[PDB]
Amino acid sequence: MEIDEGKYECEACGYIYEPEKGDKFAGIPPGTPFVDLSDSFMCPACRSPKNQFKSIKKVI
Numbered sequence: 001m002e003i004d005e006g007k008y009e010c011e012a013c014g015y016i017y018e019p020e021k022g023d024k025f026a027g028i029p030p031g032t033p034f035v036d037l038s039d040s041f042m043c044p045a046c047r048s049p050k051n052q053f054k055s056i057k058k059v060i
């Protein structure tokens with residue numbers, strides 16, 4: 001792992017929301033940052049609350 005952007009991963013099921021692709025699994029156009037999701041957005045993989053999504057802005 002090594003990058004920083006609007007990439008979010010589900011700490012619950014490990015899903016991964018891509019802003020450059022949009023929340024297709026849910027219903028959002030590409031180029032949309034996870035910051036544009038509503039507080040009611042649910043993971044399209046495990047249906048968890050958007051509050052369970054975390055970004056990946058770290059590089060080792």
Ligand SMILES: [Zn+2]
Pocket residue numbers: 010012013014015043044045046047048
């Ligand atoms: Zn999930």
